[PDB]
Symmetry: D2
Subunit: 308 residues, 4 copies
Amino acid sequence: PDFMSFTSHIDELYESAKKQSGGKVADYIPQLAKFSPDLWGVSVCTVDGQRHSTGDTKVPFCLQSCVKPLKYAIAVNDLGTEYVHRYVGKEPSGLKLFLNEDDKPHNPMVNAGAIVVTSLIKQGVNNAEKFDYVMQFLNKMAGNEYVGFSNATFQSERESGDRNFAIGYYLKEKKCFPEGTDMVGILDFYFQLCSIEVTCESASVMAATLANGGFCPITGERVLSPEAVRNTLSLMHSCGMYDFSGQFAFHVGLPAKSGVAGGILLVVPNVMGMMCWSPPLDKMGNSVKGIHFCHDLVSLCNFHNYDN
Amino acid sequence: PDFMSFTSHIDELYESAKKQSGGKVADYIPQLAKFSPDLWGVSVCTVDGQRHSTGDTKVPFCLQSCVKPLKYAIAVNDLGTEYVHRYVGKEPSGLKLFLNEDDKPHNPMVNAGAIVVTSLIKQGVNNAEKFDYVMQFLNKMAGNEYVGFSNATFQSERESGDRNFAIGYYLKEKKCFPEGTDMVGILDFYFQLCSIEVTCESASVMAATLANGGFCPITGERVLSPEAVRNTLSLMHSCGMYDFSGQFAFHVGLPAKSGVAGGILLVVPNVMGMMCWSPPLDKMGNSVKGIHFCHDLVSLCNFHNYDN
Amino acid sequence: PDFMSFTSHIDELYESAKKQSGGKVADYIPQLAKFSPDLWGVSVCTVDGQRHSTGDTKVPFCLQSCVKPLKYAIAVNDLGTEYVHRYVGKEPSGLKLFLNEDDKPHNPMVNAGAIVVTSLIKQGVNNAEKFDYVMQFLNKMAGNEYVGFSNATFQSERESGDRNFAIGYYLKEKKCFPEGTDMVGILDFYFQLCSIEVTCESASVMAATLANGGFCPITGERVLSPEAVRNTLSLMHSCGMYDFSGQFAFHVGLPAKSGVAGGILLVVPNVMGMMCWSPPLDKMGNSVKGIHFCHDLVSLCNFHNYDN
Amino acid sequence: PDFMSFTSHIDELYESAKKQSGGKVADYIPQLAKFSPDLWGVSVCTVDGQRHSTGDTKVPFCLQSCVKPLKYAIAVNDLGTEYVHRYVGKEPSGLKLFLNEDDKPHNPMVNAGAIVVTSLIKQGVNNAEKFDYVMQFLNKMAGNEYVGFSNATFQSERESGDRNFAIGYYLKEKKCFPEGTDMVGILDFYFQLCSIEVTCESASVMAATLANGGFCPITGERVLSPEAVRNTLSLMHSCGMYDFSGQFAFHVGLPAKSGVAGGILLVVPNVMGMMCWSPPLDKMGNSVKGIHFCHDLVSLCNFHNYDN
Ligand SMILES: O=C(Cc1ccccc1)Nc1nnc(CCSCCc2nnc(NC(=O)Cc3ccccc3)s2)s1
Ligand SMILES: O=C(Cc1ccccc1)Nc1nnc(CCSCCc2nnc(NC(=O)Cc3ccccc3)s2)s1
């Protein structure tokens, strides 16, 4: 109703979260370890295309697990709910097992689930074509704003990803992939997708596409089917913030997805999309400043799912 | 926008669900076993007080676990989020343990959590006064419509409730109750609350109070604080349908709570409250006709939480 | 071969273990909390009736969980392997669940298993007669040496035993007891059996009866059937030392059973029985001096099950 | 005392077990699937070198998991208890997790534990030299009797062993191997060791070496240290028969190790070693005829660990 006044509040919330200096920058690969703990950016894109940024909103960082709801949305857009969910579950798991009782990954937001979803997209073509296809989808979601790639993060993630190779071999053992899948090639594609780079600005447009029923707000183009968006938002709401998912659902009540680079892709349905980014993570793997910002945003603007 | 046309659709959905003859009427106590499998009623109360009923909507039945979100709402209304959640958790558990890692019941929608919530209400007074206090709250939620009591169900539940006595003694062992709690007396109060009787009509008004931000739509009276309603709706959405909670959240996306008598208390935020009732339950403990009706309602009217 | 020389070694091992001052005396009831941490006794009874004691070997203490293999032996002696094991399992559990996948307690050495075994002995008579019957069996096992009773420990265990009442109600729920069992009465009998008092001297004769194929070495009387003794020794070997059972089996390799009063009932098959007692327990619930003594005994005399 | 009469009983037990036609021959690789379900052999080697065979005792088959206690014995012989158990646990697990709470495989008898033990033997040399070293040890254990190799089983196990590659990558992730370990090379060596072929006759000599305190009974040569043998027998007793380990310990009470080719390596301490072989396996993965034979042997000869 008054965007200028809303941005003053966003700036005040950004300043309050800026003081939260806690957390640890992820350091399992050098490409993550090098990031300054003081980098902090918040970008907003409303469903009507109004924009606002504060802080470090043009510094590229990897999507990491923030890409999981995006590739899940692409798979449902192309294949439908029924086909996708023959391979992956629909609910959160309690706070280590690679598969649920039905030999399926628990949901698309955990590594095993995202690895399986990766195997469903553009089957039958080489990895260069699969990657180009997802890149063109991400460009449409961001209204052609910054979508890049970190080869150094890709190389390091693959070289050091023993846990993801253990998951790949266990999924292969339990026949989790579509028949004729080259599992090692799927792991390559998975590491590549995690290594896609965005800024707070471009990622806020991707979150706004999810908030706007699948239509990119800065172009007006239909990018994702209503079904893909609805499924993605439901799973971001219950499975998107690692083992903090349940507490985030109760106190924040918004669909969101965190990543190890410090990003939090946030959706306020029919209102706006946001990307909050600060490299230091708490014990759950979520950006300390971003979590603080999310709690403050809902308390101030009453954006919670069940707020009257 | 057009209530008369909406009731025609409700009637059509009722007729389609009426054909779903599957399921088994609960038979662990004779008071449940005696119910006809053919009883089926649907009642609606909009946030503006518009009413509609079809089927067996004036036959009393016990709330059973449908009372859990109601007594949780009373506890938060009187004590606040912080105090209540020092004793009970805020998230769903995976598909048997009485307590989570912090020695707290997982959430207010499981037996252990509801037993703990029962111990927080009107502390310091006798059971007759505690029960009268909850009854007056339930009368306000229902706009003074049918709120009764089944002494036979209370007597049978207590006599045969070995699992709930095992939970009571384990909670006592782990110091789960407020100091000075008489655990056996809390179990009596718990069994009494489960044995409160409603009809589809009166229970639909209680669900409409939750849909209307805590204000009873047929009286205009404020019954529950905004915080109590918001917390209750969040926990009904993620924990309300037993081990079907996760699948209900994904496909239906509405706050709901089932009970072993075949009731499903359903909330469509800012639109209406409903009570669906049919004694035969599926393997998850949820009313077969009610589950079928809930899926059909969301597919027809687009009431899902993340529907654009 | 040379008992006089063997007792010199027992005395040396006693002196070395005497220096191990670590551990904490159990303090959940005052009757355990009052024991001096410096009390330390070791008694030996060979299969030929040769006796040796060092330290505090005539100070009475409660058997506590040391009674579990004894009442299990009585149940198998009277009912046979097949009947007893229709109610209780035969193997160790990993390091909290009251029942295994078949709704049976894991084994007779855990509380749930011992509560079920208690329900199988002398069915059909009052508790006074059941207790007198077990007392006469324990007197025969000890060659009529010290077998007493601590009413104060019985009263305190029952008053504070919420976890055991939670187990009793869960076993009742899952139909774990023989039909017509009065569960509360079984819990009374269980608490009474745990409160039976022995000295190191009399308990060493009970352990020697188990080492001598069921024949009391100081009387020559057959007390337990060969089958009862064989089953009891197998379960003491794999399930007798709480969560230390697996490490005790590997490094010590002898059938043994610990209790919260600091007792360790030890059997060296066809050689001797022993009772080691020192109230301070380690984090696993086992007597610190007794564990140290057991490891030293096997390293010195080569008593391990698989020692050549 | 009378070997001629004992062999008459062995023949009678062989004939009774021959009638047990149940079970399913393992068919996950063609090299196992091709074996006749009617092949059944029993070989005995006493600690004094007396021999007896009945049935198909010269038909080669793969050791498979029967090799696990043998390579564990080699590792303890060369490195000692302390060093080996810094990498692997000492106890049975309940009836799927790759590691225990300390990030160690549960014991040397499960795949993860055997893979870790494989990484400890002859570190620093190529796989050809590691394999030759283990082969020379196995030749000494068997008194230079049949020790062969199945290249077809090795090739198939490696090609189809996705679960073992998932375990290898998870162990690498959790730093389970000695520093500088080439995990893929360890998996090659592991598959090779499982593919070593024996007959009932030669394997009975290996079991007799374990029964004779590490001395080969047909040569008199010391092959394994007393410590290696004692540790191996303890772990075969509690962890050797898959999820049947606990029931085998209680009813049979002998150290034994089964394999998917239908072999059961059995040790009767200070008496004899045996190899029972019949390809059809029960639901636990144990040879049906061999399990039946083991139960009958203990009931007839009173060979149980705790038999008086
Ligand atoms: O995590 C600890 C230590 C610890 C730490 C803390 C506490 C205890 C223990 N150890 C670990 N070791 N490996 C780990 C990761 C891979 S789990 C092995 C492969 C599987 N992946 N999915 C599976 N799903 C099912 O097996 C389905 C199912 C579910 C339920 C019922 C039946 C069937 S099995 S975690
Ligand atoms: O359910 C089966 C058989 C089965 C069936 C199917 C499959 C397997 C087994 N057997 C059962 N036996 N009793 C049962 C119910 C009462 S559970 C005992 C009392 C407790 N209540 N809450 C607790 N919470 C924690 O202990 C917290 C914690 C969580 C995680 C880590 C540390 C600490 S312990 S279910």
